């Protein structure tokens, strides 16, 4: 008679960024070789659930879980609190449910993930007052040099040529003017 | 040859700062040939170095007949920082043109006016398709990207050098190369998603 609850393997360093989809896998085994169901804004497919031989020791049950931390999820300055502590249960066909097993989802601002590369230099007439065409060229050069930042991020250019990269979660990066623009006359 | 050539005086031109324009003269003399022309501006004793004319087909015989005259291509661009006087009646240049034939007759001077205006006076931007935002009081970075892309996609005639900015409320500012602006109010641009 089966009286042994299933065993759950959880990943340990799940880190996510706001507005960006993440994925990870649970691994569940039972001595009978069969796992009936599990219990946890996180999505996963119940395919191959409650099938004989779906959770052997050779081939554990792999539950691909995916979700997205909300773009505007507040992040405390004490980044050890910027995490979700959640639990997962699982039971076999005999009706033996495992204990509550913890997995941690730590969420961070998008600027923690991205370090923007400097663009090719744009030559301007006045370092203190960029024209509209020069600002367009600055934004295009920053975007072309940074294909790894999301397309939904907004790049703005100030009068002195300073670049502000506002990511979809409203976090920011800054590129100073002397990494972006140069006086046209002093270079000729 | 005793009588001077005749120049068909062109219509007055409305030019915009940063926008290239062009037009044509037409000159006719008895000999059929015209040597050179003179282009000067009243109040500008050194002329306009941004207003050019083509010296093509000049002085060659048969270029200025009554049936086939000499068409001179005059082109130029008003500078981006050309000051626009508050009295727009003074925001214009009065040109004058003389023409020599092969012999040496000079024509009477014909005059025409080049009125220059801000670059925004040429453009009346079309409204974009509505961008649905989460909060009219604070647009997201992606919502402003969609607004700018929608305004740019609906206005291919607006110069690519013009910069489109989006405020926190969806107000669109189109800044043209000469720093003149167009404005598209938020009610024509964005809407809240819940409604
Ligand atoms: Ca069991
Ligand atoms: Ca960063
Ligand atoms: Ca003559
Ligand atoms: Ca306008
Ligand atoms: Ca832009």
TrEMBL record, chain A:
Superkingdom of origin: Bacteria
Record: residues binding Ca(2+) 1: 2, 4, 30-31, 92, 96
Binding site for Ca(2+) 3: 112
Binding annotation for Ca(2+) 4: 139
Binding annotation for Ca(2+) 2: 111, 114, 173
Protein's recorded name: Platelet-binding glycoprotein
Organism: Streptococcus sanguinis (strain SK36)
Gene field: srpA
Portion of the parent chain present: 252 to 449 of 1625
